[PDB]
Design an enzyme around this catalytic site. Structure first.
Site, PDB file in Angstrom:
ATOM      1  N   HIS A  41       1.008  -1.204  -0.063  1.00 16.09           N
ATOM      2  CA  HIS A  41       0.030  -0.098   0.337  1.00 16.09           C
ATOM      3  C   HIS A  41       0.732   1.137  -0.071  1.00 16.09           C
ATOM      4  O   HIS A  41       0.212   2.195  -0.126  1.00 16.09           O
ATOM      5  CB  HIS A  41      -1.065  -0.168   1.046  1.00 16.09           C
ATOM      6  CG  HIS A  41      -0.440   0.338   2.473  1.00 16.09           C
ATOM      7  ND1 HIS A  41      -0.319  -0.961   3.431  1.00 16.09           N
ATOM      8  CD2 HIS A  41      -0.208   1.335   3.015  1.00 16.09           C
ATOM      9  CE1 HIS A  41       0.097  -0.379   4.398  1.00 16.09           C
ATOM     10  NE2 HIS A  41       0.216   1.040   4.309  1.00 16.09           N
ATOM     11  N   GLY A 143       2.181   5.919   9.668  1.00 13.04           N
ATOM     12  CA  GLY A 143       3.740   5.770   9.404  1.00 13.04           C
ATOM     13  C   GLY A 143       4.371   4.641   9.880  1.00 13.04           C
ATOM     14  O   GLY A 143       5.499   4.435   9.359  1.00 13.04           O
ATOM     15  N   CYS A 145       3.520   1.797   9.312  1.00 12.30           N
ATOM     16  CA  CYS A 145       3.273   0.494   8.408  1.00 12.30           C
ATOM     17  C   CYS A 145       4.742   0.016   7.956  1.00 12.30           C
ATOM     18  O   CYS A 145       5.684   1.023   7.646  1.00 12.30           O
ATOM     19  CB  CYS A 145       2.480   0.760   7.282  1.00 12.30           C
ATOM     20  SG  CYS A 145       0.620   1.236   8.039  1.00 12.30           S
TER      21      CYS A 145
HETATM   22  C1  LIG Z   1      -5.215   5.548   5.093  1.00 10.63           C
HETATM   23  O1  LIG Z   1      -4.280   4.512   5.447  1.00 10.63           O
HETATM   24  C2  LIG Z   1      -4.460   4.093   6.923  1.00 10.63           C
HETATM   25  O2  LIG Z   1      -5.046   4.420   7.549  1.00 10.63           O
HETATM   26  C3  LIG Z   1      -3.534   2.525   6.722  1.00 10.63           C
HETATM   27  C4  LIG Z   1      -3.474   2.445   8.331  1.00 10.63           C
HETATM   28  O3  LIG Z   1      -4.207   1.610   9.032  1.00 10.63           O
HETATM   29  N1  LIG Z   1      -2.381   2.867   8.875  1.00 10.63           N
HETATM   30  C5  LIG Z   1      -2.228   2.806  10.376  1.00 10.63           C
HETATM   31  C6  LIG Z   1      -1.603   1.390  10.924  1.00 10.63           C
HETATM   32  N2  LIG Z   1      -1.416   1.194  11.933  1.00 10.63           N
HETATM   33  C7  LIG Z   1      -1.656   2.385  13.130  1.00 10.63           C
HETATM   34  C8  LIG Z   1      -2.277   3.451  12.506  1.00 10.63           C
HETATM   35  C9  LIG Z   1      -2.654   3.848  11.061  1.00 10.63           C
HETATM   36  C10 LIG Z   1      -3.368   5.088  10.807  1.00 10.63           C
HETATM   37  C11 LIG Z   1      -4.332   1.495   6.166  1.00 10.63           C
HETATM   38  C12 LIG Z   1      -5.784   1.414   6.120  1.00 10.63           C
HETATM   39  C13 LIG Z   1      -6.362   0.432   5.825  1.00 10.63           C
HETATM   40  C14 LIG Z   1      -5.546  -0.655   5.014  1.00 10.63           C
HETATM   41  C15 LIG Z   1      -4.273  -0.294   4.740  1.00 10.63           C
HETATM   42 CL1  LIG Z   1      -3.284  -1.860   4.396  1.00 10.63          CL
HETATM   43  C16 LIG Z   1      -3.624   0.394   5.470  1.00 10.63           C
END
Ligand SMILES: COC(=O)[C@@H](C(=O)Nc1cnccc1C)c1cccc(Cl)c1
Ligand SMILES: COC(=O)[C@@H](C(=O)Nc1cnccc1C)c1cccc(Cl)c1
Lengths: 304, 304
Positions: A41, A143, A145
């Protein structure tokens, strides 16, 4: 003496962290040999995340669109490929700090350390368990990820997790290092059911053994139970059913303490049915399930 | 989201660990520049530990009696000196892996990471607090002496603790890196009173702010209190009295959440007087005091 939620020393993993940027998205990558692994992603914009066609999005990218920076040094990307939910960026330089490593797919109930990173920089390290429902209860912000989970056996790092997302419930989901999600999750911004979680019974029993070893013994009783009777209690309290495989793994702790596994099950049954009555075990007022029997033996014997 | 007991990444400290042997005793040392620091009781035999005359014991040792090994490489000892309860072994080679560092004496209530080591090899990393009574509740076994506690600010490691001993109660005692014990302890095998400990109030309040930030809010109430009223409750429950200095340190969390510090004090007062009624906060069934207000801001903002 003393028992702590201990993480593996993170140094060998710190040497592998890089920042990967594609377009306007920046996340962490793991640089091992001449390959950088990161969540696919990184190629998405916010508008793409609702329903990304990763194949189409990746076709619009070339090697020069993936900016990989290891601290101050910039890596030259000579190839890219998507494997499941991870991208593999071939670089022209092998990481000089690559430890001896393996990629493993851990089982639910197993534990590992997470090196939380932002922009390719390590921020902290903590130990956690892969829940029976294939989620992890971590500490991750936007951030993070690409941050990874791992275990270390002497000089070998077994990478088992790469962070991808936070579910709307605040729990975390990710993949093995081949990009296969743990659990039913997909890398899209859609509400996704995690499914019923359970408490990891064999880990609670291991932690009760760790408590006895360190002097917290008030919960030991004059009772015993059977696997069948204990499992009726485990069912009522949403604990994983205990099997002979779990009893076998607890053998070393049972031998060290002289407390039969079914006798410890009777202590756990009484704690489930009566609670802790305002008392604590190893500084906790609840039954802890993030220590495996191997973790207890390692910590109680000082393995390096 | 999510909140974990996070340790600093240990890599910079791992590069400093060495094994120090003197006679038949082996423990850990910290190699920074051309000096190796270790607990002075490395010069004792078991018979000496009951009442050691360290000055006399050290006079029987020469540079060649201190065997210092950094993994596989042997260091050449060209000088030795005792400073308080630590030995400083001058070596002929500066540690190439010496990070930017400082030696600091932390205050009670402050937190730090411990890299537990055996035979100069890192085994694990965990975060803990220096208790108000100057003990630490760590996880240490025989051979862990010389393991260190530290904090990291960007690229600077501030070493604050070196492990020396386990009190007969199973809690831990050690020194700053100038060899001064934290607390009233002496490096002898004698039963030693630690004195009354208290709960670190400002840390519990910081952790309640972390809970609100992550969505655990059930403990928020319609009440407020004063510093005077709250401190009568703190006295009854063996909590540290809250001061305006503590209220000031909680300013950033109060500003971020919009919850006045005295309103959070009223939530904490109600939790002290009523308990948690079988509920949890951030996965804990007790009031956690091992997170400082700085720790909460760092973790909640993803500082690297
Ligand atoms: C808009 O992108 C996001 O919010 C990320 C995510 O979960 N990041 C994220 C990860 N961990 C903690 C907080 C956050 C925020 C997202 C969402 C859905 C699917 C995927 Cl594969 C990735
Ligand atoms: C005989 O020597 C010991 O037991 C060590 C010690 O506490 N080590 C030790 C440290 N931490 C955990 C477990 C152990 C065992 C000792 C005792 C008293 C005074 C000092 Cl300065 C040192």
């Amino acid at each position: 003496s003393g028992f702590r939620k201990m993480a593996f020393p993170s140094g060998k993993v710190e040497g592998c962290m890089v920042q990967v940027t594609c377009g306007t998205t920046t996340l962490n990558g793991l640089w091992l040999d001449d390959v950088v692994y990161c969540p696919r992603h990184v190629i998405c914009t916010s508008e793409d995340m609702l329903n990304p066609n990763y194949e189409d999005l990746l076709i619009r990218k070339s090697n020069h669109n993936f900016l990989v920076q290891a601290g101050n040094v910039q890596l030259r990307v000579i190839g890219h490929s998507m494997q499941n939910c991870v991208l593999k960026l071939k670089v022209d330089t092998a990481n000089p700090k690559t430890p001896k490593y393996k990629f493993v797919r851990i089982q639910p109930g197993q534990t590992f350390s997470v090196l939380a990173c932002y922009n390719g920089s390590p921020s902290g390290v903590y130990q956690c368990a892969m829940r029976p429902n294939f989620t992890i209860k971590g500490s991750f912000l936007n951030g993070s990820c690409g941050s990874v989970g791992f275990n270390i056996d002497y000089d070998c790092v077994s990478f088992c997790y790469m962070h991808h997302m936070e579910l709307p419930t605040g729990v975390h989901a990710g993949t093995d290092l081949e990009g296969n999600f743990y659990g039913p999750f997909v890398d899209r911004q859609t509400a996704q059911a995690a499914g019923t979680d359970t408490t990891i019974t064999v880990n609670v029993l291991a932690w009760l053994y760790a408590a006895v070893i360190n002097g917290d013994r008030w919960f030991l009783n004059r009772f015993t139970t059977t696997l069948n009777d204990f499992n009726l209690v485990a069912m009522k309290y949403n604990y994983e059913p205990l099997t002979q495989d779990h009893v076998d793994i607890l053998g070393p702790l049972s031998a060290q303490t002289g407390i039969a596994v079914l006798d410890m099950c009777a202590s756990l049954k009484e704690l489930l049915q009566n609670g802790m009555n305002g008392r604590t075990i190893l500084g906790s007022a609840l039954l802890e399930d993030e220590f495996t029997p191997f973790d207890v033996v390692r910590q109680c014997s000082g393995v390096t």
